[PDB]
Design goal:
The structure is cut from a larger assembly and holds 2 copies of chain A. By secondary structure, chain A is mainly alpha-helical. Chain A contains 18 helices and no strands. Chain A: Belongs to the PI3/PI4-kinase family. TRA1 subfamily.
């Protein structure tokens, strides 16, 4: 059934859907019963020239009336996700001339399913453009520009869902970016409600909730913020082909603002928000003025809003903040170094998260010991204050080892399982079809404490129990942290007091070991 | 000053056996106000914060405080007062210093019953807003820890409540459970740690999973409490609520309509962060949904829901959750057949990554349906997928075993296209071992002998300058191919192959200049000698020649015991030496070739060898 034989499966249903209330299985379920998954190397065109007039006559009717609860919305969404499932290598313009007339009709209206074709049909025309160029690049890209011109009307009428993820990037872009600059600047550098400046009078600091009950709808902020996070994700790509101008100091305050008012009821947007943040911070010149304007103080646990999804966004956010802090390493004075080792030793001693983040935090403190040594070598007056810092971080190393040792026998229990789950998983491998060790002898001889374990018995487990080697993780932690300790304890030799008070006969032995 | 006061009091309690106060506890409260005052002094004036000596003093102070608290008659109030003491600051728990005292608090079976009293004023600490959310989260830790400790290493709620005798906190939990209305004022009152609602969800899950039969007047409050969590907007709280309501409707109190609703809500729109939650939820929900859907005969729409959602998000990543939904239970299946084409197309699209271990468990499903019986195009589809997967490169051996069982329930020569060419040769050899063994199963491999002869001509002449594994793994399929009941009643079709392979052994044994040509002759001569008593008996002297070459480069490996590198290529020469022993020894029809062969055998007994084949040659002398 990978041929024209599908057509007689709906040759009786070749006519249109009459009485569309109870006819939900006649014509719309042709890509739904059986004829959606069979192989088609060059078998599409035996029926693909029958899909386009059939779906065309389907799309001629079914107007823009969205408010009624599906007398026609079912077949509308049915042809919508038919349009995404079809992959073609021919006749691209019969697809393209019959999809634009609906997306040019839903420019200002977005309420009660008002035009949710667009985030799928513009992506399908993007996919057909990426198959082969159709030299239509100045017609379809104007509609999203009129969306951007409609957004002042959308913000004045609310006293959304643009989804611009692949809408402006086409991987070549031989066009201008100034209109893209203006359509970004018309909504980025504005107060997104008229109420966010007046909540900063209570800033003495941060807002956990988005708005304290000022907008009645409370769903527009959720959608508008989601769209703002989408656009803040998507203008990062523009930086690599050409340098962005007309504004350079407007991104950090909007980054801190969007991190402050992400909703606690969702967690997907924070992922690409932190991804856009690390894509900014992976550059060379954008990461210089950013630590000045956040002052390295709004980069704390305010970025986890709602403490039931700030457990998957922990390693990402901590790794980006630590990567940027390791990237600067010269702007930091001693106060910011104290403030960051005070939080990263807590990340190291936190047992709730993974081992790789703790190893990364220990690596960050080892990367900071050079800046501490150089700053202490600059001015000797704060040279004791640096040295005590080197006794903080290694103290946390001493704590981390302690946090392992108390788990010792508990670790041994899992090691027991790691014997059996290995011992029953290597003796199922000797059932191979190989020979020369059995047929040879056949041919020859034929003629002759539960304290940490209480977490693993919770009824809502939320994560499967690990089956990795605990002794390998323990050896990894011990070897890494002991190499770091050897480095820092050798580096403590520059903060010795002068040996004139002890008045030793050999100061050449001093300032090497004795301190 | 704080360090001085702490170690002065620690010295005064160390010099005595117990407290110098004699468990009075008035200077310890003075030390508590000392700690609060020095924390306020270090928070207002910003001079020098977060030292070493401050942390060591706080550790010593917690040690002496919890030393006094385990040495008193009223242990119930000062522990919660210590939780008040670090409300503003000072860590979240003294790791294995406070939690060790709480693990002492969880005595087995509550014989003394102090812990039940502790749970009483513990939940009074929870419901009263006398502290911030972090210490009520530590109250979650202690309450749920003693509850699941009584659940795990005892009977599930068999000692606390026996005939509704002394509940004494469950009515406070009724008062707590009743406030959930209007979203437990989540919107109205701002709480920024969401561990509190997860605490309450896990506490209800403890009561549901532990013992839902001794309690019967609480169940409507339980189901409305766990159902009010459905209408939230977060994901992990929503799927944990789905998990606990599937726990309840798998236990008892089964409704008719909404169980299909929570089922279709479980298997629709589930992203990456909640995969284990929906796995546990479906694995708990579906064995009672099957037995309570089949209470009436004709309702079997719960397969149609899976089919509709499987064809909804077609050829995407989220379908894989449904792909191993049908794999973890299987006895509720082998009642549909479009599932088979669906999973065959899914494994054929997912084979081309790291999810290969998914697709094998798809194929291991299909055979489990076939043995459940004890189409047509899909047979050659899945066998072509299996052959292409095993020649594309544990679990490949599982693919081997499943194809070997599946053939007996493509059948043309496709391997002409089969660096990595030697790896494809070995995988092709492993494939043709059984795919020639499993067809024409009456010893009927003679019709395709020219085709398979031209197929294997490019690998029976393999080991001229390349590795040994090609011949060592094609040896098995040659050993299967050259047993065709001999040629005494059939036409001379295996006989030209026999003459061809014996002249190949001849022309490869005329090459004695390197250690690569000597393996092919002895291996193919051994398979001819094993599968036939007749062999090259007029041409047995090149076997003696290669045996003497094997002896004279055993002289080269006599003065070293082992090789530094390339160790396998000496013990494989010893292995083919054990081959050539029996091969040139079991026939004693030699001519003038007996005396140099026996002198080489005596030379082999002479110098230092390994015992495992010296015992073989003394058994051979016994014969």
């Amino acid at each position: 059934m990978s041929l024209t034989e599908q057509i007689e499966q709906f040759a009786s249903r070749f006519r249109d859907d009459d009485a569309t209330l109870q006819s939900r299985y006649s014509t719309l379920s042709e890509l739904y019963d059986i004829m959606e998954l069979l192989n088609s190397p060059e078998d599409y065109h035996f029926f693909l020239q029958a899909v386009i007039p059939l779906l065309l006559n389907q799309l001629k009717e079914v107007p823009i009336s969205y408010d009624a609860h599906s007398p026609e919305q079912k077949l509308r969404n049915s042809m919508l996700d038919i349009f995404n499932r079809c992959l073609m290598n021919q006749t691209f313009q019969p697809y393209a001339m019959e999809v634009l007339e609906f997306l040019l009709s839903v420019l200002p209206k977005e309420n009660e399913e008002n035009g949710i074709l667009c985030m799928k049909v513009l992506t399908t025309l993007f996919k057909s453009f990426k198959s082969i160029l159709q030299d239509k690049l100045d017609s379809f890209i104007r509609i999203i520009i009129q969306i951007y011109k409609n957004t002042p009307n959308l913000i004045n009428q609310t006293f959304l869902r643009s989804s611009m993820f692949s809408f402006k990037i086409l991987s070549e872009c031989p066009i201008t970016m100034v209109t893209l600059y203006s359509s970004y600047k018309q909504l980025t550098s504005t107060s997104l409600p008229e109420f966010t400046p007046l909540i900063m009078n209570l800033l003495n600091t941060s807002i956990s909730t988005e708005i304290i009950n000022r907008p009645a709808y409370c769903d527009f902020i959720l959608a508008q913020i989601k769209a703002t996070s989408f656009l803040a994700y998507v203008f990062i790509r523009g930086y690599a082909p050409e340098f962005l101008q007309d504004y350079v100091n407007f991104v950090p305050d909007l980054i801190i603002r969007l991190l402050q008012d992400c909703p606690s009821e969702l967690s997907s947007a924070r992922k690409e928000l932190l991804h856009a943040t690390r894509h900014i911070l992976s550059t060379n010149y954008k990461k210089l003025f950013l630590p000045k304007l956040d002052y390295l103080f709004d980069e704390r646990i305010l970025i986890g809003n709602g403490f039931t999804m700030h457990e998957t966004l922990r390693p990402l956010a901590y790794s980006t903040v630590a990567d940027f802090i390791h990237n600067i390493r010269s702007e930091l004075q001693l106060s910011e170094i104290e403030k960051t080792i005070k939080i990263y030793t807590g990340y190291l001693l936190d047992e709730s998260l993974a081992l790789t983040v703790q190893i990364m935090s220990a690596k960050l403190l080892l990367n900071l010991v050079e800046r501490i040594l150089k700053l202490g070598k600059e001015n000797p007056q704060e040279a004791p204050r640096a040295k005590k810092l080197l006794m903080i971080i290694i103290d946390s190393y001493m704590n981390r080892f302690k946090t392992l040792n108390r788990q010792y026998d508990t670790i041994m229990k899992y090691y027991g399982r790691y014997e059996t789950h290995k011992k029953e998983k290597a003796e199922k491998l000797k059932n191979s079809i190989q020979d020369n060790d059995k047929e040879s002898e056949e041919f020859m001889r034929k003629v002759l404490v539960e304290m940490f374990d209480i977490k693993n018995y919770a009824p809502i487990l939320l994560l499967p129990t690990p089956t990795n080697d605990p002794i390998k993780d323990a050896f990894y932690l011990y070897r890494t942290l002991m190499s770091f300790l050897k480095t820092i304890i050798h580096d403590l030799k520059v903060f010795n007091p002068p040996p004139n008070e002890y008045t030793v006969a050999n100061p050449k032995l001093w300032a090497s070991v004795s301190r | 000053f704080f360090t001085n006061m702490v170690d002065l009091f620690n010295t005064m309690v160390i010099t005595n056996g117990d407290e110098w106060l004699k468990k009075k506890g008035n200077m310890i409260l003075k030390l508590k106000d000392m700690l609060n005052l020095t924390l306020k002094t270090i928070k207002e004036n910003s001079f020098y914060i977060d030292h070493l000596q401050l942390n060591q003093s706080i550790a010593k102070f917690q040690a002496l405080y919890l030393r006094f608290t385990e040495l008193s008659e009223r242990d119930q109030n000062p522990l919660l007062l210590d939780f008040i003491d670090f409300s503003f600051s000072n860590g979240i728990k003294a790791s294995y210093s406070l939690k060790k005292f709480i693990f002492h608090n969880i005595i087995a079976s509550s014989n003394k019953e102090k812990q039940n009293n502790f749970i009483n004023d513990a939940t009074l600490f929870v419901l009263s807003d006398k502290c911030l959310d972090a210490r009520i989260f530590v109250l979650k830790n202690v309450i749920n820890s003693t509850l699941i400790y009584e659940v795990a290493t005892s009977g599930s709620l068999k000692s606390y409540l026996v005939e509704d005798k002394k509940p004494k906190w469950l009515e406070l939990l009724h008062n707590k459970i009743w406030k959930n209305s209007n979203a437990i004022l989540a919107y109205d009152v701002l709480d920024h740690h969401d561990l509190f609602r997860f605490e309450l969800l896990q506490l209800s899950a403890i009561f549901i999973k532990a013992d839902p039969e001794i309690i019967a007047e609480i169940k409507k409050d339980i189901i409305k409490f766990c159902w009010n969590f459905i209408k939230l907007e977060d994901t992990l709280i929503k799927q944990s609520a789905y998990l606990v309501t599937s726990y309840f409707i798998s236990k008892f109190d089964f409704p008719i309509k909404v169980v299909t609703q929570v089922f279709v809500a479980l298997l629709r729109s589930s992203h990456v962060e909640a995969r284990y939650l929906v796995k546990q939820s479906l694995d708990v929900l579906t064995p009672v949904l099957h037995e309570r859907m089949n209470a009436a005969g004709t309702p079997d729409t719960w397969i149609n829901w899976v089919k509709r959602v499987m064809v909804e998000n077609s050829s995407s990543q989220n379908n894989i959750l449904y792909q191993f939904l049908i794999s973890h239970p299987d006895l509720f299946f082998n009642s549909r057949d479009l599932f088979i084409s669906n999973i065959i197309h899914h494994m054929n699209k997912i084979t081309f990554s790291d999810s290969h271990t998914l697709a094998i468990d798809l194929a291991s499903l299909i055979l489990y349906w076939e043995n459940k019986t004890l189409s047509l195009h899909l047979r050659e589809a899945c066998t072509a997928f299996l052959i292409r997967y095993v020649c594309a490169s544990e679990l490949g051996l599982r693919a081997i075993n499943i194809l070997s069982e599946l053939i007996s329930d493509v059948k043309l020569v496709y391997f002409e296209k089969f660096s990595e060419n030697i790896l494809y040769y070995c995988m092709n050899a492993l494939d043709v071992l059984y795919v020639f063994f499993k067809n024409k199963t009456k010893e009927w491999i003679m019709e395709n002998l020219p085709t398979i002869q031209n197929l294997l001509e490019k690998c029976i002449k393999s080991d001229h300058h390349d590795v040994q594994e090609a011949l060592q793994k094609v040896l098995q399929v040659i050993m299967k191919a050259i047993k065709a009941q001999g040629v005494s009643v059939i036409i001379e079709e295996e006989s030209p192959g026999k003459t061809f392979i014996q002249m190949l052994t001849s022309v490869i044994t005329q090459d004695l200049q390197e250690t690569s040509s000597v393996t092919a002759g002895v291996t193919l001569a051994w398979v001819l000698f094993m599968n036939f008593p007749d062999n090259i008996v007029p041409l047995l002297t090149p076997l003696m020649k290669t045996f003497s070459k094997l002896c004279k480069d055993h002289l080269s490996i006599s003065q070293p015991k082992d090789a530094m590198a390339l160790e396998e290529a000496r013990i494989t020469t010893k292995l083919l030496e054990k081959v050539l022993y029996i091969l040139s020894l079991k026939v004693s029809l030699l001519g003038d070739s007996r005396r140099p062969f026996l002198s080489t055998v005596a030379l082999l007994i002479d110098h230092s060898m390994d015992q495992n084949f010296l015992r073989k040659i003394v058994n051979m002398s016994r014969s």
